[PDB]
RNA sequence: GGUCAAGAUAGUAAGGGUCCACGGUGGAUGCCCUGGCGCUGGAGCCGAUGAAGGACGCGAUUACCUGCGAAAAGCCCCGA
């Protein structure tokens, strides 16, 4: 979600943990359209996770490569 | 008290007029400030690392404005 237990993971695991949220994030949209969206907060939260993910896989890209 | 004659004069308001009471309309006037103007001083360039200014988006619900930019009313770090 936010600490060093997130960045510690592999490169193809970062791409994997991005799309895992997106699969849910799309299912939430399909639920929203139907009228079974009792947890709207989950949508805001999942999108936040993808942001942090992409932010980090750009912090570690610049570090080492100088 | 009565009939006849001779005179004179009142009241009626379909509608109008002046004044008064009460209203409707309208937004003057007074009070206000959420907005402006001037002068004084500060500060004074932005852009191929892509501007000024825009299009289309981003919301559980989003027409308008705001903020943003598929990492989308926000993501990370430092400080208060």
From Swiss-Prot:
Keywords: Ribonucleoprotein, Ribosomal protein, RNA-binding, rRNA-binding. GO terms for molecular function: rRNA binding; structural constituent of ribosome. Pfam families: Ribosomal_L29 (PF00831). One of its GO terms (biological process) is translation. Disulfide bonds: none annotated. One of its GO terms (cellular component) is cytosolic large ribosomal subunit. The keyword Ribonucleoprotein applies. SUPFAM superfamilies: Ribosomal protein L29 (L29p). Gene3D superfamilies: 1.10.287.310. Part of the 50S ribosomal subunit. Contacts protein L23 and trigger factor when it is complexed with the ribosome. Belongs to the universal ribosomal protein uL29 family. NCBIfam families: L29. Binds the 23S rRNA. One of the proteins that surrounds the polypeptide exit tunnel on the outside of the subunit. This is Large ribosomal subunit protein uL29. It comes from Deinococcus radiodurans (strain ATCC 13939 / DSM 20539 / JCM 16871 / CCUG 27074 / LMG 4051 / NBRC 15346 / NCIMB 9279 / VKM B-1422 / R1).
